[PDB]
Structures are given as C-alpha cells and as structure tokens.
Design a protein around this ligand. Structure first.
Ligand SMILES: *C(=N)[C@H](C[C@@H]1CCNC1=O)NC(=O)[C@@H]1[C@@H]2[C@H](CN1C(=O)[C@@H](NS(C)(=O)=O)C(C)(C)C)C2(C)C
Ligand SMILES: *C(=N)[C@H](C[C@@H]1CCNC1=O)NC(=O)[C@@H]1[C@@H]2[C@H](CN1C(=O)[C@@H](NS(C)(=O)=O)C(C)(C)C)C2(C)C
Lengths: 298, 299
C-alpha cells in the first residue's frame, strides 16, 4: 500500500482553465463568472529584466489579449491589477463556474495542483506548502497560472496560482487575492528562499505511515520527550510540536508513541545509513497527519 | 523544474462512477451508456472463504441490486458475468458518457487510477504496471471497482478495475473485458506474486529526469555496452533493453549517453550509499520515457 501523494479529482476545476496570451507571453488563467484571473506578468514586454507594472498597465491595449478556451474566444473589456495577479473582465460568463471560496494555505498544509499548459489542463498532483511559502512541484514554460485547489467538506477552495520558479528550484505562487505566498517579488530576480524548516508534524505522520507499511528498522527502544525534541528542533530547522494528540490513532494502531518517533527523527536527520523509508532516502514532510490517516484507514 | 508522479485529469471519468451494492457488500461501478460494470464479487454471500460464483449467480436476484449516483437511483434489468466482472444493464443511459475505448495495459506502462469509495470519487493518482500484472496502489476497504484510465491522442481508454490485494500488499485488477491482469483469481486466497522484474527503460528515463533536475553524482567516466548490461539485467531481475533509440533526445539534452546510465544502474543497484536521487533512496521504474520527456519539455 505504501505511501504516495494523491490529488483530489479535477472535475470542477478543468472547465475554468483558459489560455491567456499577450505579446510573447502565453500562460493560463482562471475563468470564474465574467472574471479571468491570471499572473500579471503576462503583460510584461520583457521578462528578462525588471518590469514596471504600472507602466505596462498604462500602455496595455485590451485588443492584444487572447483569452480562449477550446473554441470560445473571450473578449477582454477591462484590465486591473489585484496584487500580483491580473484580473480581466471578459464579455462572456463561464457557464460551468463551480461554487467556490478563496482560501490561503499555511505552511505544512497540503493541496492539489492542476498543472495547465497554455490553457490546456495536462496533469494533477498533490503538493505541500513549505515553511517559506514555496512548494516543490513540476512546472515548466507555459505553466504559470496553474491553479492550486483543495476540497474540504464538499466546499471547493481556490488557493494557489503559479508565478515563477526560484533559483533553487522551489516554485512560487500567490493566492487568488494577489498576495504572493512567502512575499516574493513577481520579478525576474535572483531572490533567495530562506532556510527551509521541516514540519515535524508531517515527518511523524510520514514515519507512522512507514510503520503501517511494515518498515520499522528506524525504531529503537529509546524515547525522546516532547520538550527535549522541541529544544532540538529549533536548532536544527524543524518546527516544534504543540502536542501529540493528532497522532493518537496512528500511535495505537502502530504500537509506537510519538516520543519514539521523535527520537527516530533526531537519529535519521543525520542520514539513513544506506537504508530507505518508503523508498525515500531522507525525511519527508509533505504528508499531514490527516492525510496519512485517511490514506491508510479512510 | 521538478519531477512528480502525475495523473491525467479526471473530469471525463468522475460522472461515470456509481455506487454498486448487493446485500451487505458495497463497491464502485463504471456507468457507460445503459451499462454498469462492477467486480462480480459484490454478489458473493461470503468474502471470507473460496467463492463458488456459479452458485452465487444462480441465487442472484435483480431487485436486490442497488446502483446509484448522487441520490439518483438506477434499476437493474439484467445481470451477467463477463470474466471476473458483472455487466449490469440499467434503466437509464448515462447522459455524461464520454467517447471512449477499452484497452489492456502492458508491463512498464503508466495509467491513472481514480480511487473511489461507495460511488464517490475521492482521489486520482498515477501508477505503473509491474511485470507480474500488479500495481502498487493504495486501495483500502471499499475501493473495489475503482477505475483505471489513460488518455492518448485525445482518446480516452478504460484500462483497469480494482478487485483485490494480494498477501504481499500488491494490488490486482482486471481490464474492462473481465480479464484479470497477471492471471490472478478473484478468490480470497494466498496467491503469490511472481518475481518483480524492474523496467530498465523506465529506470533510464528516471535517471535522465535526474540529470535534467541537476542530479549528476551517479554518472562517472564509465559507460557500459548494451549487451553487457543486458547480460547483467537477466541476472538481477531487470528488463533487457532492445536498443537505446527511445532516448535519442534525452541523450542530446543532457549530453549523457544511455550507456553511461546503464553503468549507473549496475552500480546504483548495489545501494545509493547514503545519497539520494530526487528524494529517492533506491532506483525507481515508475516513469516511462514518454512520461519524462513530456513532463520535462512539454511536447
Ligand atoms: C510561468 N509561465 C513560468 C513558470 C516557470 C518556468 C520554469 N519553471 C517555472 O515554474 N514563470 C516565469 O516565466 C517567471 C516569470 C519571469 C521569470 N520567471 C521564472 O520563473 C524564472 N525564475 S526567476 C525567479 O529566476 O525569475 C525562470 C528562470 C524562467 C524559471 C517572471 C518572474 C516574471
Ligand atoms: C474491495 N472492496 C477490496 C479491496 C481491498 C481491500 C484492502 N485492499 C484492497 O485492495 N477487495 C477485497 O476485499 C477482495 C475480495 C475478497 C478478498 N479481497 C482482498 O483483497 C483480500 N486479499 S486476499 C488476496 O488475501 O484475498 C483482503 C484480505 C481483503 C485484502 C475478494 C478477492 C473477493
């Protein structure tokens, strides 16, 4: 059964993806109602140098936009900035607009990515929000505007829109309100990502999933207290756990309390010694405790 | 730019999933036209012991069936075995039936699993068919009838329907014609999966994806001839490579010949030595050459 990333189904999101073109830039937009949200960098005359966005807005011609989906051409009637996103009002309303809210994702939380290639949905996969506000996915040219989403209790939330990839390979996007996650600039810059902080909540859930998979070599007879682990975590770029309550079910099923896995984290952070855990060679923090519980038990 | 096991979008498949129940057994079915296809063990009176399907079919009653989708219910007017699958005719044609075909999956090929629970699609993810006709899915209770599909050249193929989980954890399903992959029986028995043979085509593609993503510690000034690797492959449960021509473009982009990666495989098979390749601590044959080329370069 192992442990793998899953994506919630994409049915409600795909009919909202449109191809947005301006000049030499071709990417994706999110068509909801008569609005189309896209990364505002699409109207940049040159993405190899610093962009003055209000200068580009004052020189924008709505007749140069090309917003389409399949065989429907959407005429742009108004353009406005909203943060780092471009909000374009079109002459047609999306007949397949789903009931939806807008939500911001926090660090250590999982969501789904509908990877779209120049207006065409191509694939869908699950990601996780790193401490600095980035994610580790797979984006290439023409995939900006790809939408992140998550369904909670039958409520569809749009949470992410892709903008850029940093030099270290981390991927940077914004919420649908135009606020960039982690506060990164939407410029072709050399800006750095901070030091990454592993979510210890997720590493413990990852280690519980490995015990359910019959992988127990990393568990010894040594325990480590919560307080002592939290003192170790802040000097080793791990978050501190508030409590062990979230793992009550996983601990009873596997026969290992959180304190046993906390000791494993400290030992395995120095290297797996040549062995693997769920095919990984390092600690994985992309699975929340709720994810692991649902994937293993439903 | 990254490498992730991806699934194709599920929008054309979700409206075809239905809940299928009979007595105390509940699973998923595939609603196309006025036909619903499900695993036949939904009518088994006892999943605990060996099932006599001839007795179960003789004592079946159409009205004891219940197939439904979003509070709308379908009446079963006919039930028939087709291989290990039940084919039920219902009194309503699926208005969202997509243009589709049926197809079998070969070893080493990738397809998409739409995991479902009691007729409600829950998650979608990509899998790769292992050499013995199994997949390392994540099916748990109530996921029987979950549908595998693949989109090729704008043609939708239904390729998989979930049945059981072997004692070793591997997952066995059938195609949509009732033929179980790998020849396993739909019986609660201790069937043993054969020896897994790693797809060398997929491992090479995985290592090419690593080079594209900046991983290169596993390549040295060494390179292994194709025949020399194939002789090693038949000894260490790896597929033999007919040629290197499927990697012509990947070899040009990364400047690394297949032969250089062939020696990497032989060395890496003995362990990574504490190093990683795109988070992996072991070789992974879950990505085809076509998967990698498309994910890295768009195409
Ligand atoms: C959207 N269409 C792309 C997605 C990129 C392409 C490679 N991987 C991705 O995630 N975004 C951009 O093209 C984005 C646009 C221009 C430059 N840019 C980048 O992502 C660059 N990275 S960076 C932070 O060094 O500028 C690069 C080098 C193209 C990956 C702007 C930031 C406006
Ligand atoms: C469908 N609802 C299940 C899917 C299973 C549940 C656990 N993981 C899965 O993939 N199918 C069955 O329950 C299936 C039914 C009965 C026995 N069976 C199994 O998968 C069993 N495995 S085995 C090969 O030992 O019989 C088991 C013990 C439930 C996992 C039959 C084959 C009819």
């Amino acid at each position: 059964s192992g442990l793998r990333k899953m994506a919630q189904p994409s049915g409600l999101v795909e009919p909202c993806i449109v191809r947005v073109s301006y000049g030499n830039n071709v990417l994706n937009g999110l068509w909801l109602g008569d609005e189309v949200i896209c990364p505002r960098h699409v109207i940049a005359s040159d993405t190899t140098r610093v962009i003055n966005y209000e200068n580009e807005m004052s020189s924008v011609r709505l007749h140069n936009f090309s917003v389409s989906k399949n065989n429907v051409f959407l005429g742009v009637v108004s353009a406005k900035y909203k943060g780092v996103n471009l909000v374009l009002k079109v002459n047609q309303v999306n007949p397949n607009t789903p009931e939806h809210k807008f939500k911001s994702i926090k660090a250590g939380e999982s969501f789904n990515i509908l990877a779209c290639y120049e207006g065409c949905p191509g694939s869908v996969y699950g990601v996780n929000m790193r401490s600095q506000g980035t994610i580790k996915g797979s984006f290439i040219a023409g995939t900006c505007g790809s939408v992140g989403y998550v369904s909670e209790n039958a409520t569809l939330y749009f949470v992410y829109m892709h903008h850029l990839e940093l030099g270290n390979g981390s991927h940077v996007g914004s919420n649908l309100e135009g606020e960039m996650y982690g506060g990164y600039e939407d410029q072709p810059s050399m800006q750095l990502e901070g030091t990454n902080v592993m979510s210890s909540d997720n590493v413990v859930a990852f280690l519980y999933a490995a015990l359910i998979n019959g992988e127990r070599w990393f568990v010894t007879n040594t325990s480590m207290s919560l307080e002592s682990y939290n003192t170790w975590a802040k000097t080793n770029s791990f978050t501190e756990l508030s409590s062990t309550d979230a793992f009550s079910m996983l601990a009873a099923k596997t026969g290992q309390s959180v304190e046993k896995l906390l000791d494993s984290i400290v030992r395995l952070n120095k290297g797996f010694g040549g062995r693997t855990i769920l095919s990984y060679g390092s600690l994985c923090d992309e699975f929340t405790p709720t994810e692991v519980i649902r994937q293993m038990y439903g």
